[PDB]
Amino acid sequence: ATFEIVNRCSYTVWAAASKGDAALDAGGRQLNSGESWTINVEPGTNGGKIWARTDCYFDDSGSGICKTGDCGGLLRCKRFGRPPTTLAEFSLNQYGKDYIDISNIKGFNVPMNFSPTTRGCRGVRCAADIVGQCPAKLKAPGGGCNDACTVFQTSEYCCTTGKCGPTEYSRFFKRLCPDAFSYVLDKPTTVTCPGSSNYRVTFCPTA
């Protein structure tokens, strides 16, 4: 229920936390380089996500724009953010267990490590330089690395059938981050944790 969101990047990020229809805790906060933000998530939260936003501008009421991960121009996110966005996904207290993962299905903007701060399971990590190695057709002009579905809107990339396979692009994401979801029907890299665990999301976990 406790998530410490740490920004080890050299640049300011704007952390966001939402379960799709509502904000988790405040829903969003500015994180300068090195700052930590502890948030509390309801037990039993299904389908929550934490991500980082890049190059944000907000007014005095918390309205503005982010060049990655914008959630309707809000500082305190109540909706999911705009791709490209590296996703820390979690479902808490699901029949006794927690389930965590990192997803590149909505693209990649900032590296992250998603680890438990309590005993019982391992962490996941996507820290490679996906933005620097991004294929030309996927690069967001000011947003990092898009996913194939965001760029091309085809059944194969978006898995609207529910019977899809890997591509060039998913395979690039999976080559740079094997621990993260590259496409929808990817072999699950989901980690099972003891119910009611606590976690740390670290942006730019490495150098």
Author numbering: 1 to 207
Question: What's the paper's own text on this?
Answer:
The helium path was used for collection of anomalous diffraction data at 5 keV for two proteins: thaumatin and the membrane protein TehA. Although anomalous signals from each individual crystal are very weak, robust anomalous signals are obtained from data assembled from micrometre-sized crystals. The thaumatin structure was determined from 15 microcrystals and the TehA structure from 18 microcrystals. These results demonstrate the usefulness of a helium environment in support of native-SAD phasing at 5 keV.
